[PDB]
Design a protein around this ligand. Structure first.
Ligand SMILES: OC[C@H]1O[C@@](CO)(O[C@H]2O[C@H](CO)[C@@H](O)[C@H](O)[C@H]2O)[C@@H](O)[C@@H]1O
Ligand SMILES: Cn1nc(N)cc1-c1cc(Br)c2c(c1)OCO2
Ligand SMILES: Cn1nc(N)cc1-c1cc(Br)c2c(c1)OCO2
Ligand SMILES: [Cl-]
Ligand SMILES: [Cl-]
Lengths: 135, 140
């Protein structure tokens, strides 16, 4: 379904990276956040939902999803909580040296993941085609 | 046309908001940033080009665009600078929701959500969100 995303956390350099993947397409939105907390999680979900039609997010159901702030954020946005990360960590690696800050490396990796063409469409192309069609 | 964005800065509560608009559709991406510097500007542009096909950005051509870091970022992402109202509507929505948000950044993101989801012209219309995917899908 075009409205389905998966959200997973990954850790590197003592920081926390949230990675949202649009399941149908492989398109990614990711951010380094200061700490894996409900407030930062709610905020990430709020940003994501304002940029793409998010209907359902599948999560790891952990501590940062149980609190008042995250439930509210999802409620407000109309969201229901009913491997790829390895490759992103690979890209972060090959570009890590080109930035002082991890956050910059992560965003370069997001750009690269979403633009890559391996018929032969990028994730960016796939997400737009899947959603346009739904509409 | 589908790859053209405009980027302008807005100030509020002593902070700076960068607002990128997809000219063809009216869809927006916005962020409160630490300060209006080349580094933060480069980073905003890098995030933006990672998420939508940005070919050309129209900017205010100011100090934060003259530096080595922003030029590099644009070069890398493959972005072109060409020539130099919603920013007021967004101002409005932000005010309308400022109350329910602890931090300004939260208000801004609530305003982005609202701006991009709102139905233009009611029934049959199409939100900016819908318009942008429709424009870019068509281009492909
Ligand atoms: O997070 C608060 C504030 O920062 C923004 C950009 O201004 O997001 C950035 O925040 C971190 C800065 O250290 C980065 O790790 C993160 O990846 C980056 O996007 C906005 O979302 C928000 O207004
Ligand atoms: C990679 N690529 N090549 C094109 N012709 C268009 C695109 C493209 C890249 C990203 Br990222 C996108 C997108 C399209 O839609 C939303 O996100
Ligand atoms: C508002 N709306 N109503 C729908 N049925 C779909 C959408 C919709 C909302 C946002 Br934001 C989008 C989008 C579609 O494509 C990328 O960003
Ligand atoms: Cl998580
Ligand atoms: Cl600016």
């Amino acid at each position: 379904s075009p409205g389905i995303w998966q959200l997973d956390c990954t850790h590197l350099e003592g920081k926390v990276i949230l990675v949202a993947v649009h399941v149908a397409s492989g398109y990614i939105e990711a951010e380094v956040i200061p700490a894996e907390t409900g407030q930062e999680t709610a905020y990430f979900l709020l940003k994501l939902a304002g940029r793409w039609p998010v209907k359902t997010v599948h999560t790891d159901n952990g501590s940062n999803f149980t609190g008042a702030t995250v439930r509210a954020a999802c409620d407000w946005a109309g969201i229901k909580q009913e491997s790829m990360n390895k490759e992103l960590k690979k890209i972060i690696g090959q570009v890590r040296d080109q930035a002082e800050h991890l956050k910059t490396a992560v965003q370069m990796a997001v750009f690269i993941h979403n633009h890559k063409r391996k018929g032969g469409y990028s994730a960016g192309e796939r997400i737009v085609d899947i959603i346009a069609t739904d509409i």
